[PDB]
Write an enzyme that holds these catalytic residues in place. Structure first.
Site, PDB file in Angstrom:
ATOM      1  N   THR B  13       0.859  -1.145   0.000  1.00  0.00           N
ATOM      2  CA  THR B  13       0.000   0.000   0.000  1.00  0.00           C
ATOM      3  C   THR B  13       0.921   1.228   0.000  1.00  0.00           C
ATOM      4  OG1 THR B  13      -1.843   1.153   1.197  1.00  0.00           O
ATOM      5  CG2 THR B  13      -0.371  -0.195   2.586  1.00  0.00           C
ATOM      6  N   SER B  43       9.302  -3.617  -5.802  1.00  0.00           N
ATOM      7  CA  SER B  43       9.674  -3.509  -7.226  1.00  0.00           C
ATOM      8  C   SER B  43      11.121  -3.807  -7.448  1.00  0.00           C
ATOM      9  CB  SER B  43       9.281  -2.151  -7.861  1.00  0.00           C
ATOM     10  OG  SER B  43      10.139  -1.095  -7.398  1.00  0.00           O
ATOM     11  N   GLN B  44      11.955  -3.858  -6.392  1.00  0.00           N
ATOM     12  CA  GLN B  44      13.351  -4.353  -6.589  1.00  0.00           C
ATOM     13  C   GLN B  44      13.340  -5.777  -7.134  1.00  0.00           C
ATOM     14  OE1 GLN B  44      11.866  -3.755  -3.807  1.00  0.00           O
ATOM     15  NE2 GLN B  44      13.236  -4.050  -2.035  1.00  0.00           N
ATOM     16  N   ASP B  75      11.360   1.770  -7.279  1.00  0.00           N
ATOM     17  CA  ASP B  75      12.721   1.376  -7.689  1.00  0.00           C
ATOM     18  C   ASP B  75      12.872   1.076  -9.161  1.00  0.00           C
ATOM     19  OD1 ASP B  75      13.133   1.482  -4.867  1.00  0.00           O
ATOM     20  OD2 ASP B  75      13.734  -0.593  -4.697  1.00  0.00           O
TER      21      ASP B  75
HETATM   22  N1  LIG Z   1      11.873  -0.740  -2.682  1.00  0.00           N
HETATM   23  C1  LIG Z   1      10.410  -0.424  -2.623  1.00  0.00           C
HETATM   24  C2  LIG Z   1      10.194   1.095  -2.377  1.00  0.00           C
HETATM   25  C3  LIG Z   1       8.731   1.544  -2.592  1.00  0.00           C
HETATM   26  O1  LIG Z   1       7.804   1.158  -1.816  1.00  0.00           O
HETATM   27  O2  LIG Z   1       8.528   2.292  -3.564  1.00  0.00           O
HETATM   28  C4  LIG Z   1       9.782  -0.931  -3.935  1.00  0.00           C
HETATM   29  O3  LIG Z   1      10.303  -0.585  -5.030  1.00  0.00           O
HETATM   30  O4  LIG Z   1       8.789  -1.715  -3.920  1.00  0.00           O
END
Ligand SMILES: N[C@@H](CC(=O)O)C(=O)O
Ligand SMILES: N[C@@H](CC(=O)O)C(=O)O
Ligand SMILES: N[C@@H](CC(=O)O)C(=O)O
Ligand SMILES: N[C@@H](CC(=O)O)C(=O)O
Lengths: 306, 311, 306, 311
Positions: B13, B43-44, B75
């Site tokens: 969320t 998204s990593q 990311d």
């Molecule tokens: N590393 C997280 C940072 C975020 O919530 O945007 C992601 O890319 O899912």
């Protein structure tokens, strides 16, 4: 009446003729150290420069190093950490060919000498002088593939601007440099092996594996966002860090710090957060931390002071 | 009558998908909103299968709705955005949104970001502009948009060609549209694809190891993107491995680790000699996206170059 | 165990309730000084703030001043030059309404207190803290009409970034501030009258004439390019400067210095070049130079040191 | 066959007009160039009569040539560029160029700038994009372009919406075009005008004097542009003078001294109540340009606002 300035050349473009106005500001001597495109810059050339500058410090009032734009920000930071001479060291290059219309090289060199000749430039670390601006070796980076104005200190800003052969300096780097670092390169002939791996969607672990199988001393991750790692890559680096490979988390993102206390438990994994050091810069400081320590905790404190 | 907008969620969320809508009750002032959790990853960890899944879903559900919002991590948002900009065939707005601060933190950016993404997805003027990213009151095109700062809520910028429009008080003044071909003007048809060609990215720096490039070549990768120094230049060892690879049919695209500007043809590298492709303004992760898709149509470097000149 | 931080309010938004997390970092006391939109900021409010801060310096460990965004950069610089307290003074504001979605005020205030509570923030001048960033009062300016990230030190960069309630400070302003300036405002009840006139094509001399007829102590020109003046405007200011009106050349251009030794003979006309001070900032420093001197040459040296 | 390009010069040399062409002999690789010295002033002295003269000349000579380059000082180039973007009716490229360093200085930028302006004026793809500024290898639109730095050769930027294209090796990849109406899509016809309505600009800051605004009102000015604080806000005294003035038929446009972003409607100022116009992304000197021209068509504030929403 005028400063003695030594120009160390590392590639192409003599030049007291080519920019006759240098004669108004300094007595210039010139030495060809090596002759490469800076895309081929390497550990050897770095060691040579630090030694030459360190050896010839009492023979001149300042240094100007002519260098390609591609890896200028790597060499500047390496020299920033390893130079023990208190006198100005100014790096300079050109975005446009020597023989091209409105070539930036002539005035860049002039402003580089101006900066090297200014007593106010001492004790500010190694500098890069491009497009009328004095930039500290730590924060400086190239921001555009073709723009003459490419060199910027994208996190903390320039130290000074150059107008009519004068510098109003309003800043100086707080991080320790030159003679305030323990890095001493005077007796080294090679540096620790450090590689850089890129993160992106569906990233392969093969680049990271290949460095680990090769026994690299360190691996810098060009992470996504705030230094995050694609799962494959994370697993491989988590393993490298427990096996004798120092792991530094940087970011492909061009500005801002890779911070501690975000998504990655650095201490559980034995990883170090690069802060504002981009990956190529983090590599420089990791190679040098590794001549002193292999301890992730000690390496982290080096990343917090230099 | 308010437009029907679908939110496809890919992770957590930002203000799971049912919770986010209740978190932004003001959304029903502007749309009839429906959410589906498509996946739930950081998204990593973004990957090809999520990209195939998203594109196929937008294309399948196009007639069911007036617009799409995709909630996504910051990311790799710029990667997804571009994949979708090249593969969605739906000509209703597709808008990506994320947040830089956690939903629970003071001054959490996700609430208003989500609101602005919906505004954008509901605007008739948003159609036919390609896939969009909406962050910090700004509408950005999926091709140029990239994250510029590790932490700043204002990180998302179209660093070469600028934004498409700005959002004030729920309205958008659009002043630009991408000229590069997108959406239903690309030949890329992912409807029957189960996987994407293998494309890795290698970094260039002083004293760069050739091992990463060799590792990709030994694994039989269909393509390699170089994150070059300056105007797409390559360290000696890396050059030599990638010249050999291109000679044996690996597609090789020169991009740049430098964060703005084109990797140009006719600079220090003789591309036609080596069978190399210049990425233009595509950064390395973005050049990967286009090269993967190019490799579904052709393995010829000259045709791949023309693809890099049109999309 | 925690710092005493005094919040001075100059407009709207109590707040230890509204941001309960302040209680983790400081003991906050709050005082409403005035209640205006900062588009109505004026000399009176400025004099009041400097005096209050100067008077209450030993009663607290730091100050936070809540202020509108519109003229925040004017007040910050005024306080920067007139505050004699060595303790942090942090200004802060909000781009979005208090009651709006994703309101920036809460976290901004928190980061402002964090900064005021940090002992590393002392002796850095008056600061502005917005969007996770510590900005010096001299260089800080608003760069966008609506963006939360509007506040930037557009010439010399920020002093520090704030992550997880900690500041890595890497810079500090070289120009003299606070207790290194001779400006002492403790007994003044009004400031010298200084106006700002705009330059552009076919510019009227009437704005400049109206200030001269009014007997203004000084006029700042928001020049074109490198501080140039439309012909009408130049003629009128050339005349004001020989008649008892101090004239400072600034620029409408948002970054860079208005330099000496460019197109304008400053000494022939009795004009002063603002350097990197934009027009509203130049006004601040001109008003204060005029409490000490009316001599164009002395005023120029003030413009070169503060 | 190379295109015929005319250089109209307005001041000194950047590499008088005959001397500049001999200074850049490479121009004949790309065009058949002809120069006319139209005036010879520093652009700090730019004025309405030069604007009328330029527009009438481009419009009169349109069929005689394939394209125009206008050499011009940097100081007010963004003003001229916009005046021309609203009044030229010729649909061949009109390109403005200048230099930040003097022609005689080391690394003089004018030579290559002039070259790039000609390239741009000769490109068929440059047509129908409005009036252009070419500086530092970049093609910028006349509406958004502004000078950002007092000295930097890279000062010219389209700070809200970005550039139109970048110039490498004599070729332009265009990726954007201005959506706001320009050139032959505006109603402004200056062919029979001998002068322009009077519009002054007043600055806002703490403790701002009302004298500058009163002086313009007492002189019977047709219009006043406020260079407001933040989102176009005005200091009390200045507000009060300009409210009175608008009540007696002076047109009043709120712009902002802040260098990027729109002065928006529906913020702290009730424009409809006062008869005020919001400038949008037009900076004060640019809002002046459009208001002057608006005042040749109407004195009604609502019609002037619609003009500020379309051009
Ligand atoms: N590393 C997280 C940072 C975020 O919530 O945007 C992601 O890319 O899912
Ligand atoms: N690639 C070249 C660019 C330059 O000459 O600056 C080099 O780094 O040597
Ligand atoms: N115009 C308002 C904006 C804000 O509240 O920040 C003020 O300066 O007081
Ligand atoms: N002030 C001069 C600077 C230049 O040559 O561009 C002008 O605008 O004419």
């Amino acid at each position: 009446h005028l400063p003695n300035i030594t120009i160390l050349a590392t590639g192409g473009t003599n030049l007291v003729n080519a920019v006759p106005q240098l004669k108004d500001i300094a007595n210039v001597k010139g030495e060809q150290v090596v002759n490469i495109g800076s895309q081929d810059m390497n550990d050897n050339v770095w060691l040579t420069l630090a030694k030459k500058i360190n050896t010839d410090c009492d023979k001149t009032d300042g240094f100007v190093i002519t260098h390609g734009v591609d890896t200028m920000e790597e060499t500047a930071y390496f020299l920033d950490l390893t130079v023990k001479c208190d006198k100005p060291v100014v790096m300079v290059g050109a975005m446009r060919p020597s023989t091209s219309m409105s070539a930036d090289g002539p005035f860049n060199l002039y402003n580089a000498v101006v900066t090297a000749a200014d007593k106010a430039s001492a004790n500010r670390g190694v500098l890069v002088v491009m497009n009328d601006t004095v930039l500290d070796g730590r924060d400086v980076t190239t921001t555009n593939t073709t723009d003459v104005a490419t060199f910027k200190s994208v996190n903390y800003g320039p130290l000074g601007y150059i107008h009519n052969g004068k510098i109003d300096y309003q800043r100086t780097p707080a991080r320790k440099h030159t003679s305030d670092t323990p890095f001493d390169v005077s007796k080294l002939n090679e540096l620790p092996k450090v590689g850089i791996v890129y993160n992106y969607a569906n990233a392969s672990d093969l680049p990271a594996k290949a460095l680990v199988d090769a026994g690299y001393d360190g691996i810098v991750s060009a992470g996504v966002g705030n230094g995050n790692l694609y799962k494959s890559v994370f697993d491989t680096l988590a393993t490298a860090a427990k096996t004798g490979t120092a792991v530094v988390r940087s970011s492909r993102v061009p500005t801002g710090a890779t911070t501690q206390d975000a998504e990655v438990d650095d201490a559980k994994y034995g990883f170090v957060a690069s802060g504002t050091l981009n990956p190529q810069k983090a590599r420089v400081l990791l190679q040098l931390a590794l001549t002193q320590t292999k301890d992730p905790q000690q390496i982290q404190q080096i990343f917090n002071q230099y």
